[PDB]
Amino acid sequence: MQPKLTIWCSEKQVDILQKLGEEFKAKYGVEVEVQYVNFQDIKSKFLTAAPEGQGADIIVGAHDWVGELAVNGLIEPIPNFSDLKNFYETALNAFSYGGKLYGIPYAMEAIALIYNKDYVPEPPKTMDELIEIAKQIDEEFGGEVRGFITSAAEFYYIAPFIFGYGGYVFKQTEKGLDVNDIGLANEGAIKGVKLLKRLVDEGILDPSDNYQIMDSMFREGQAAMIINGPWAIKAYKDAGIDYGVAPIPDLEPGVPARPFVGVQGFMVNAKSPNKLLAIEFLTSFIAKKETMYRIYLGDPRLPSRKDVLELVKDNPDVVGFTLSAANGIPMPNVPQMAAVWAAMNDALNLVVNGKATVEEALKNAVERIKAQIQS
Numbered sequence: 001m002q003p004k005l006t007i008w009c010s011e012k013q014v015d016i017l018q019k020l021g022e023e024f025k026a027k028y029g030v031e032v033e034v035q036y037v038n039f040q041d042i043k044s045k046f047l048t049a050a051p052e053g054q055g056a057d058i059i060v061g062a063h064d065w066v067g068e069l070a071v072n073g074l075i076e077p078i079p080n081f082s083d084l085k086n087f088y089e090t091a092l093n094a095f096s097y098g099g100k101l102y103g104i105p106y107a108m109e110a111i112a113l114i115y116n117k118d119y120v121p122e123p124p125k126t127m128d129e130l131i132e133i134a135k136q137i138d139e140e141f142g143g144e145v146r147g148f149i150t151s152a153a154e155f156y157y158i159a160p161f162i163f164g165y166g167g168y169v170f171k172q173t174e175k176g177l178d179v180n181d182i183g184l185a186n187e188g189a190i191k192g193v194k195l196l197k198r199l200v201d202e203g204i205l206d207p208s209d210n211y212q213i214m215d216s217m218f219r220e221g222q223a224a225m226i227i228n229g230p231w232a233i234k235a236y237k238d239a240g241i242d243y244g245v246a247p248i249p250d251l252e253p254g255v256p257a258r259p260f261v262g263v264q265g266f267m268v269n270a271k272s273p274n275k276l277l278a279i280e281f282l283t284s285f286i287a288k289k290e291t292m293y294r295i296y297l298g299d300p301r302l303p304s305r306k307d308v309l310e311l312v313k314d315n316p317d318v319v320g321f322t323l324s325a326a327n328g329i330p331m332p333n334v335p336q337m338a339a340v341w342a343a344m345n346d347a348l349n350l351v352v353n354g355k356a357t358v359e360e361a362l363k364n365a366v367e368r369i370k371a372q373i374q375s
């Protein structure tokens with residue numbers, strides 16, 4: 001009886017993984033099934049389905065998930081394999097927790113300014129310049145082209161402002177992250193969210209702006225500038241957008257934006273009876289140079305396998321996202337990160353909708369995060 005491996009991944013990886021799965025099946029007789037799952041639903045679906053025996057054998061996603069999934073016993077440690085040396089240790093360590101490796105990373109990433117050269121031939125260097133250019137576009141195009149869009153109420157996309165001014169999630173200490181020292185309502189976080197509020201107040205961002213609006217308007221030629229990541233670029237290129245990638249404009253003189261840095265990788269379901277075969281598929285096939293490069297070609301981010309990064313290092317998009325990531329802060333992978341996102345999203349929703357001051361919204365967010373961490 002032929003065995004089967006099921007993979008959950010976002011829309012970005014479906015095509016390339018489908019093709020690789022067909023190749024693995026032709027060679028070995030192992031059925032491979034690639035199932036699209038909305039990215040923000042992968043982890044929550046896996047938390048629900050994995051204990052019920054209904055989780056995918058392999059999930060694809062971000063390294064911040066690792067600590068929560070590892071301590072809950074839901075993802076399987078990956079034993080050493082011959083290709084392990086070929087991956088950057090920073091990428092492997094992002095997928096490591098409690099001394100063990102829990103995923104095969106394929107790329108790192110960070111959001112950046114993505115701009116349509118038809119409207120913005122040369123990218124702004126400061127946020128003050130970006131604000132002026134966006135206002136000009138909003139006026140000159142009578143509302144048919146948005147000057148600037150990002151996901152206004154989503155913490156992941158506002159983090160570059162929060163961190164640029166000195167906010168932080170958990171305090172970085174010489175003994176690791178201090179989950180009892182949260183910096184998402186310090187004066188830097190407040191100044192960064194006050195910049196978000198300025199963008200809304202000056203009409204550059206609309207209270208309803210979200211990921212789908214940003215992504216779709218940019219892909220359809222209706223947005224001059226966005227803040228988004230390298231996962232979005234292939235769709236823009238196929239749609240015919242003449243885009244560029246640049247670091248997010250400095251928040252003010254001498255204060256660069258500092259985005260989250262994320263690592264994307266393949267994790268194995270520890271509850272799956274196929275976990276040994278899933279590991280074999282990842283280490284013997286997915287981890288290889290050609291396969292990792294084919295994944296890049298299908299889903300272009302910043303490759304984690306060193307010899308693949310060398311192939312792409314001169315691509316202007318790779319150069320642009322690397323410049324943005326150079327100022328960035330890696331997302332924590334500790335289990336306590338699960339308590340962070342929803343509280344911060346809720347606080348930013350209140351701010352962009354004029355429902356609370358920045359200081360009150362962030363203060364309440366941190367009390368919510370702390371209470372959840374403490375149990």
Ligand SMILES: OC[C@H]1O[C@H](O[C@H]2[C@H](O)[C@@H](O)[C@@H](O[C@H]3[C@H](O)[C@@H](O)[C@@H](O[C@H]4[C@H](O)[C@@H](O)[C@@H](O)O[C@@H]4CO)O[C@@H]3CO)O[C@@H]2CO)[C@H](O)[C@@H](O)[C@@H]1O
Pocket residue numbers: 010011012013038039040041042043044062063064065109154155156211229231262341342
């Ligand atoms: O409680 C709210 C939600 O919190 C958790 O979601 C987190 C993620 O775990 C983080 O990784 C991050 O998500 C980023 C992601 O890192 C980044 O790559 C990008 O995601 C892309 C994706 O790579 C791409 O393949 C494609 O699917 O498009 C996505 C963008 O739409 O952007 C994400 C941010 O949107 O931050 C979120 C929280 O915002 C938790 O996993 C969720 O289950 C939970 O609902």
